[PDB]
Amino acid sequence: ENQNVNMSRTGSILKNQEDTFAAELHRLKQQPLFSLVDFESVLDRIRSTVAEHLWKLMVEESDLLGQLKIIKDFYLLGRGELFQAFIDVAQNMLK
Amino acid sequence: SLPVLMKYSVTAPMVSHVYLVNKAIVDYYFVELKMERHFEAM
Numbered sequence: 001e002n003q004n005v006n007m008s009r010t011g012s013i014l015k016n017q018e019d020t021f022a023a024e025l026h027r028l029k030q031q032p033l034f035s036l037v038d039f040e041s042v043l044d045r046i047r048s049t050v051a052e053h054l055w056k057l058m059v060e061e062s063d064l065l066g067q068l069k070i071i072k073d074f075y076l077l078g079r080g081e082l083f084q085a086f087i088d089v090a091q092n093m094l095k
Numbered sequence: 096s097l098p099v100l101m102k103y104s105v106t107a108p109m110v111s112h113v114y115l116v117n118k119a120i121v122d123y124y125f126v127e128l129k130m131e132r133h134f135e136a137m
Contacts, residue, residue, distance in 0.1 A: 012107070022096065
């Protein structure tokens, strides 16, 4: 809701998850009793279709596979030679 | 089913039209200011 409204997880300005969610809501409401299986099997449907759309968000906006090998190369030191020249110079003036 | 969900259904149309009026005044500044030529002149 902060940055941009077409970037939503469920599909709220941009998709039509909401009408299906509303039908699920009418079905859940029509019930005077309560149990565990009927409540939690449709806790999948408010999660699983929502848990895939943001996965299909951040692939295209960022090139996911780019920075998430880059950030490991800065910390686990994949570019090994590229920091030793830093280490050689930083030794002579951290004395 | 929710008083906030139907509130959220009016909400993004009210986000959509303000951005539609905001993208007209960006074009109206483009056609009358010619600002980049004045920016280079400063």
